[PDB]
């Protein structure tokens, strides 16, 4: 169940710096104050991030997502390849409570909005819903930097994340916060293509401050800096001048 | 052994290595998290009704941890023909999926259902490959589905045009045909219902009793495996040299107390060319550390057979706290360079003699 609109919105993509964000405990061992190199899939230092304020755009790799977000108007995430009834899709949802994560193969609409009522009761997102397989309930995930980064290798869908309290009016902070192992998901599925959900007041649709960045990882070499507690504090990317 | 290795049935003063040392491994423990989220079977298993043959009850199982030894040393199954794998072993290995196939039938017709075989129910109500790898489980239920009346619920395609390839069920309700005489869905000359029920009653002989059968079928779908059977974990002991299995980390060594404090989501640590130092047990969440268990050389301190005949040992770099015929010998002495036994230590100084290390050695007076 879903209408057209005539207000077209339509988002200004536009670019900006990476600086060194979008760093990851690669796995589960603990190591005091000693430098690690690693190979692995990351977002390359200084590179250009889009910047958008809803297109599908490719997974690739895997991807990193940010988002200035105040009072969370942003929902959830779909991801598969063809995104219908025909093959499998995957579904992530966050409304007031828990997050809700479905591997259900259900058909979308042109537009994937929830709404809001002002207590509030509205979902429409999908129409119908014939078969599937997995389930899985949690907390909740979410002035408030959000970052995550969304992995799926080996049959396996990797989500890491973080929270930063930011101040800077528009840029990414140049500061350093490596991102922690969120949760682990051991479903096969192909993902190519993606999409982002979005929270709208209904009663009147007014969702406008839908900024938020998005980039991509590549396979590369990292030497990672552990301090006494054990935790990322610095990190070198390899490949990018001669005196890394 | 001195002259075994020296090959020599005479040896002079000296110091001379003969083997090592190495204290054994006492016993094997194994942890691991705590047994959860175990697979519904009692619903299964305890249904207040069952389907019947010819729509067969179909049920999918995974996303958790599944007992079947509690349903294979049950004696309550009056039938228990486990052909995929053998049943001991079926706790260990582990699939991505499960079916289980439930329904009802006549106590005769149980035999039916096995690979490679034919009949009624074998071939109109439900099938089974000659290559299906699974286990089939079936039990007397006439308390139950039998009524004093007859119970007719049950039904089963009695007839059939064609044969049902494995996993094939079919709710049609086509009127059956026999001769060339059409009928528009009405019985006539050689018209006929393919579906028939049961008659089931309490004073129905066995074999024409009714029999409720349930068959668990194992799916390996490249996908992970998410169902695996449960995991037995022992007690976990300290201070002494084990072989451990923490959570399919294996190796051994002595455990002790650990102080460190890792952050909520590491499970070991290791510090230089990866050796693991501590690990965090799955159950208490306490984090633990890890000794290799003592080992070393043995040395064998002679004056010379020529002089006398009695020698001191050594063992290098090894407390002396747990060295065992020579367990107590004579006096022992700890030093820098490891135990002494079969020596005694003195107060005075003189020119060495046999250099034994850390600025000490030892001569022959006794
Ligand atoms: C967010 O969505 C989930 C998923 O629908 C809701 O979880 C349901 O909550 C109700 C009542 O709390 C339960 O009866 C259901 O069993 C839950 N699951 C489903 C699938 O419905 C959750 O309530 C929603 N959050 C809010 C604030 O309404
Ligand atoms: C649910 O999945 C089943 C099995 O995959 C579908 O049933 C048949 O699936 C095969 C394999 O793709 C198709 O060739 C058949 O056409 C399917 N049968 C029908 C009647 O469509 C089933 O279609 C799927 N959807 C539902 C609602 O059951
Ligand atoms: C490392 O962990 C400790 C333990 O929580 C943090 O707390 C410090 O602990 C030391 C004692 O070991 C105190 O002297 C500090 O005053 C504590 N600091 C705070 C802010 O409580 C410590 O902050 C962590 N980080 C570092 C770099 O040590
Ligand atoms: C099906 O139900 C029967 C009887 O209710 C179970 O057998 C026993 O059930 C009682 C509870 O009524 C337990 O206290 C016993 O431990 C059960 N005996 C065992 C486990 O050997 C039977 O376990 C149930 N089957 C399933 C799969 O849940
Ligand atoms: C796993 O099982 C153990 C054993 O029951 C749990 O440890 C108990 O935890 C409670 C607190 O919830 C204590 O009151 C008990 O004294 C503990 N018992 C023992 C033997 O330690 C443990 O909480 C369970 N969960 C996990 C994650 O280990
Ligand atoms: C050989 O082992 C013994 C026993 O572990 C050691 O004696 C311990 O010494 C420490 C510190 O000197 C004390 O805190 C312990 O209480 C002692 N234990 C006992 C049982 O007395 C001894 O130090 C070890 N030898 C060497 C050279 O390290
Ligand atoms: C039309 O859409 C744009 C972009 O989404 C938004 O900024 C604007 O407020 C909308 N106007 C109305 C009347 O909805
Ligand atoms: C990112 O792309 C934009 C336009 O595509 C370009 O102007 C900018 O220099 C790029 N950033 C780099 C190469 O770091
Ligand atoms: C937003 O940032 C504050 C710190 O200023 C933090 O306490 C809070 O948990 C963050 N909110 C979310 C949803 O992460
Ligand atoms: C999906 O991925 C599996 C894993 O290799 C592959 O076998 C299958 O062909 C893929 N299906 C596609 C790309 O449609
Ligand atoms: C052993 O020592 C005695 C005393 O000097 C000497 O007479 C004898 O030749 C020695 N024998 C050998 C085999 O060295
Ligand atoms: C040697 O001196 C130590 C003190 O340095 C004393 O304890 C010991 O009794 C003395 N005698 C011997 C045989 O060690």
Not at chain 1, 51 to 67: C, I, Q, R, T
Not at chain 2, 115 to 132: E, H, R, S, V, W
Not at chain 2, 244 to 254: A, E
Not at chain 2, 289 to 303: A, H, K
Request: hydrophobic share 35%.
């Amino acid at each position: 169940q879903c209408v057209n609109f005539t207000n077209r919105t339509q988002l200004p993509s536009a670019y900006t710096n990476s600086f060194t964000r979008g760093v990851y405990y690669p796995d589960k061992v603990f190591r005091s104050s000693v430098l690690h190199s690693t190979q692995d899939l990351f977002l390359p230092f200084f590179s250009n991030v889009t910047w958008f304020h809803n297109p599908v755009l490719p997974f690739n790799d895997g991807v990193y997502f940010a988002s200035t977000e105040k009072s969370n108007i942003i929902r959830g995430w779909i991801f598969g390849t063809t995104l219908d009834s025909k093959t499998q899709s995957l579904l992530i949802v966050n409304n007031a409570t828990n997050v809700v994560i479905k591997v259900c193969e259900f058909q979308f609409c042109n537009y994937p909005f929830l709404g809001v009522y002002y207590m509030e009761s509205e979902f429409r997102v999908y129409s119908s819903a014939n078969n599937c397989t997995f389930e899985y309930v949690s907390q909740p995930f979410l002035k408030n930097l959000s970052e995550f980064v969304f992995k799926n290798i080996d049959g396996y869908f990797k989500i890491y994340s973080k929270h930063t309290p930011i101040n800077l009016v528009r840029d990414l902070p140049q500061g350093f916060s490596a991102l922690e192992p969120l949760v682990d998901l051991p479903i096969g599925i192909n993902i190519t293509r993606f999409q982002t959900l979005l929270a709208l007041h209904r009663s009147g649709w007014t969702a406008g401050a839908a900024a938020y960045y998005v980039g991509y990882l590549q396979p590369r070499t990292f030497l990672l800096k552990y301090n006494e507690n054990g935790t990322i504090t610095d990190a070198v990317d390899c490949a990018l001048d001669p005196l890394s | 052994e001195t002259k075994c290795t020296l090959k020599s049935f005479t040896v002079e003063k000296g110091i001379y290595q003969t083997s090592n040392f190495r204290v054994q491994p006492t016993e094997s423990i194994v942890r691991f998290p705590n047994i959860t989220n175990l697979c519904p079977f009692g619903e299964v298993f305890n249904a207040t009704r069952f389907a019947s043959v010819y729509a067969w009850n179909r049920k999918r199982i995974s996303n958790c941890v599944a007992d079947y030894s509690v349903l294979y040393n049950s004696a309550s199954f009056s039938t228990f023909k486990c052909y995929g794998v053998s049943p001991t072993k079926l706790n260990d290995l582990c699939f991505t999926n499960v079916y289980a196939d439930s329904f009802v039938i006549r106590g005769d017709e149980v035999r039916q259902i096995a690979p490679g075989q034919t009949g009624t129910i074998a071939d109109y109500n439900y099938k089974l490959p000659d290559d299906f790898t699974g286990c089939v489980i079936a039990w007397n239920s006439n308390n139950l589905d039998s009524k004093v009346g007859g119970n007719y619920n049950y039904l089963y395609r009695l007839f059939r045009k064609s044969n049902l390839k494995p996993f094939e069920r079919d709710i049609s309700t086509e009127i059956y045909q026999a001769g060339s005489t059409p009928c528009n869905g009405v019985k006539g000359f050689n018209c006929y219902f393919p579906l028939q029920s049961y008659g089931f009653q309490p004073t129905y002989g066995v074999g024409y009793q009714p029999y409720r059968v349930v068959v668990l079928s194992f799916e390996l779908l490249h996908a992970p495996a998410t169902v695996c059977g449960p995991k037995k974990s022992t007690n976990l002991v300290k201070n002494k040299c084990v072989n451990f299995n923490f959570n399919g980390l294996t190796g051994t060594g002595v455990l002790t107390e650990s102080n460190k404090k890792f952050l909520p989501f590491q499970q070991f640590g290791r510090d230089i060319a990866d050796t693991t130092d501590a690990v965090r047990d799955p159950q208490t969440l306490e984090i633990l550390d890890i000794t290799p268990c003592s080992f070393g050389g043995v040395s064998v301190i002679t004056p010379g057979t020529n002089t006398s005949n009695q020698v001191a040992v050594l063992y290098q770099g090894v407390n002396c706290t747990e060295v065992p015929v020579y367990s107590t010998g004579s006096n022992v002495f700890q030093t820098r360079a490891g135990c002494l036994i079969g020596a005694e230590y003195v107060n005075n100084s003189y020119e060495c003699d046999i250099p034994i290390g850390a600025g000490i050695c030892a001569s022959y007076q006794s």
